[PDB]
Design a protein around this nucleic acid. Sequence first.
RNA 1: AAGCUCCUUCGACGAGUCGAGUAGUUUGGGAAUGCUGCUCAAAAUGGGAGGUAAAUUUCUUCUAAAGCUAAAUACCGGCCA
RNA 2: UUGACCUCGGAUCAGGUAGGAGGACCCGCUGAACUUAAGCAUAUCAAUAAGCGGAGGAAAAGAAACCAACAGGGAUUGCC
Lengths: 50, 117, 183, 88, 251, 112, 88
Amino acid sequence: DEIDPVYDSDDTDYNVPVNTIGNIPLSFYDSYPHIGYDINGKKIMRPATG
Amino acid sequence: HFRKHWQRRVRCHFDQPGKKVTRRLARRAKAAALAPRPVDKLRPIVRCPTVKYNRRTRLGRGFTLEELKAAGIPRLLAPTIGIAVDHRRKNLSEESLAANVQRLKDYKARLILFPRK
Amino acid sequence: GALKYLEELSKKKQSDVVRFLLRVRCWEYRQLNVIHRASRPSRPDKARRLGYKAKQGYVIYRVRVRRGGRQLKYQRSLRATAEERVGRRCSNLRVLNSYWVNQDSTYKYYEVILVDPNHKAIRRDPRINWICNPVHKHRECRGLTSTGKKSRGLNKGHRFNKTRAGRRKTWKRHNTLSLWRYR
Amino acid sequence: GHKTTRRVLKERPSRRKGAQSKRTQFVRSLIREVAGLAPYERRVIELLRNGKDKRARKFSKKKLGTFGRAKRKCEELQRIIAESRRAH
Amino acid sequence: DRSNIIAERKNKQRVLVLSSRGVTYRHRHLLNDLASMLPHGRKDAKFDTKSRLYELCELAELYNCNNVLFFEARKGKDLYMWFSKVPNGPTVKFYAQNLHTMEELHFQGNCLKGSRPILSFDAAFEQEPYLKVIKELFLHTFGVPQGHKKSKPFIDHVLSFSVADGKIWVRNYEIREVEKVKTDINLIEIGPRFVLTPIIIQEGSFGGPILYENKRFISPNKIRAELRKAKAARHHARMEQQRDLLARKRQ
Amino acid sequence: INNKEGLLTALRRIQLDINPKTTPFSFHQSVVASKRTEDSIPQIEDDLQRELAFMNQALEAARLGRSLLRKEGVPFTRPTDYFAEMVRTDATMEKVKQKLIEEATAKKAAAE
Amino acid sequence: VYSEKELGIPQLNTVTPVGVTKPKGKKKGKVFVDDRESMNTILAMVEAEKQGQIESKIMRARQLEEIREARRIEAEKKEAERKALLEN
RNA sequence: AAGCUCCUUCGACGAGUCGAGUAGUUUGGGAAUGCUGCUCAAAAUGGGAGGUAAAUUUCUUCUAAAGCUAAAUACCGGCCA
RNA sequence: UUGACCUCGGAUCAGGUAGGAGGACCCGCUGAACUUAAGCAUAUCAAUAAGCGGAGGAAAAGAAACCAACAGGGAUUGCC
């Protein structure tokens, strides 16, 4: 029987982040309105100011 | 190649004749103790391992159990009558088996046994 | 066969029974002294397998040594440290062999089997009069026990070329310049 | 290579070091029953009863360190579960 | 959804990149480079050599992986690289040689980890029936599905497979865009550089009948045995010369 | 042993549709060259020519891929404000930069 | 010590993108900063590295936020200019 | 009391030890060369090390975590010559 | 009320034993720098010197979880 290449609720990669930003520091984007890019190539805007 | 202290680790063989005399006197000490007996034990004929040296034979450690049995010499008696025994070696070949049983038959033919006490 | 049952039970260490016994026993050892005489082996199968006999002359002493490191790593083992301390306390006995009995998070507990070389039973019995002979003084201090052999690397093969037959001896032999009479 | 006549050698007990001892297997089973399970074995049993067999294999590997050891541990624990179900 | 893919048609492909016991540090660095380039694939540590090779098909089922990249090291010197589709697909065994890793400082190129690569294949990959089966196995492994959530959005590197000898040469380049003179592409090599000699293609996951066998493969162990035999032959020639000269001297 | 029928049967069983009439290049992103690198490598020991042939093959593939992907509307160029993890670390890039610096410095120092 | 501009050192792609580099010895197109918003963002960055270290977390956050707002307004105005010149 | 022989009967072999990850140290030796510390922690047609592209992990060779043992070896110290 | 067992104690109890010296050689632990070379750093000196512990006339090692791939060898030690 064939395998379904699917992630189960125990895999380290079940819940994948949206930021598409790796293990780099967030010292970048400090002076930018956005934080990273998504899958489709659209940047992720910072929510608001506290 | 003298980056280390060879001067404190250097050795000279000025006692080569002295050690030769000492070893010869040791062989005579063994033959004074084992006077009618040979000063060594009968060792088997073994073929050298690798392809480089497999065309020649040498003396091995001891005779195998089943080649002693084929020669007709009991296990518990062979080391007593002066035959080295090697329980680790396997014959693996009728050629080695036959060579060693022939050697043991020659030893049997040339041996003299004294009757206990 | 009770010793075989205990062997399997001791292999099953994190099992419930063994874990319970090790806990309440670790508390006892923490309440007792750091080095103390153990009236009997806590692991009789391990003791008899390592050579403990129920004669007059075989003593068992239990010791706890602090675990961890000095980032420097000590070349000998906590077993070696425990054996050396037990021998120094019982300077008149010969350390036969030691074994782990309990671990704990800050200490580590070993029972050391020792033999009296001066007791008549030991002197008359073979299999132990070798340890009566004087070449076996302070085996734990010279690395002649099981942990000492393991740490010094007394195994045969290609993975122990430098360390078998003595590391310092091998280095000295390789670093001697040999000059013969007729060169 | 060279042509030498092969000889059939006797069986070696050192080769018979492979354990077929029925009494030793009996002792292992009895000690398993008496002593019980380690906490990670309890976790594996829990996952096997709930059918998370893949997760159980993964956890057994993480605890033991090798595919083969994990497989043997899971087989032993599945046998324990089957025997318990038969006994109850 | 459980695929980690957002696309109209989902190419659900996952890889288990696995290492054997006797793998050296250079082979481990290669495995790390390939695993970093593969976001749909996860690492697996040393695999017992006494285990059966189809046990790799039950390791794949555990991690829900349909593709396996198996690094098998022999004598601690030679890498054999296996590609398969579990549980019933084709498998290919290759001998990997000439390894250079991303930590080598002559490379000069770098790329986004997880970015989807443009896969370049030589023409022989659509001519010889054996090289077409290798192609689909390469596309499934070094492909990086369209909507995978662990991928990067912008594409900046090309992975090229070429057939120069009876071997597959694998290269990896960064696409550097430079403005035209009144933008065009330059390529800068970035990563692993290895050569793969095909050995067998067998109809099965790691078994079944063989569909292709090289019949022209020379083993490093064959080379070593030839050298040893040459040394033994020199010694035997010297011994034979000594015997013949002694006989002639007796005559 | 070259079982072409069996090779093709196995190929059919694992072949995902790549036909451009129904499948997009954004979906597959594989380019097959229209010429052999064999015909461009006369001698395999010539490292320069071999690497040039490999680079040219990859370059043709990259050009066609960029054309097709820009046609299909997939983002291609990496924005200057997109900072993300690399397959090679900043430390490794620093060492490559430093060896380039020392090589150029040695050459210009010999000139001086 | 010799400058990396003097030495013909290629640009290297890191977490900071190289971008579309310009050919050497050719016309590097001059982009002009004459907009009030572009002057604002350059000025905000300059004042940021001039002021430097601040003990107060909220003050640091506000400095970063004013730089971010300058970039946002610049992007909005440039997009508006793009739309204006594309439609009318 | 002992050796051998035969067999419609039996044949027990060392666990916080292997091993996995990791830090330090060491080696010609990341299949980690050995060792130690920390975390996890085994098996029974088992385990360890090698051979091998040969089509599957076949073959070869040994039994670790208990112990004893003279000789060939070293020697600026001891009793002398 | 008494008596066993277990555990832990006292005694100038009866009988023994260890400490220190020596350390040329031996078994462990610990552990440098001067020196040499190299853009730099690892490396080298050296797993040495110094320091600590433990034996003997020798010590240590030692009867394969060895070496091999042969027609195989067969505990350890030392020389070429």
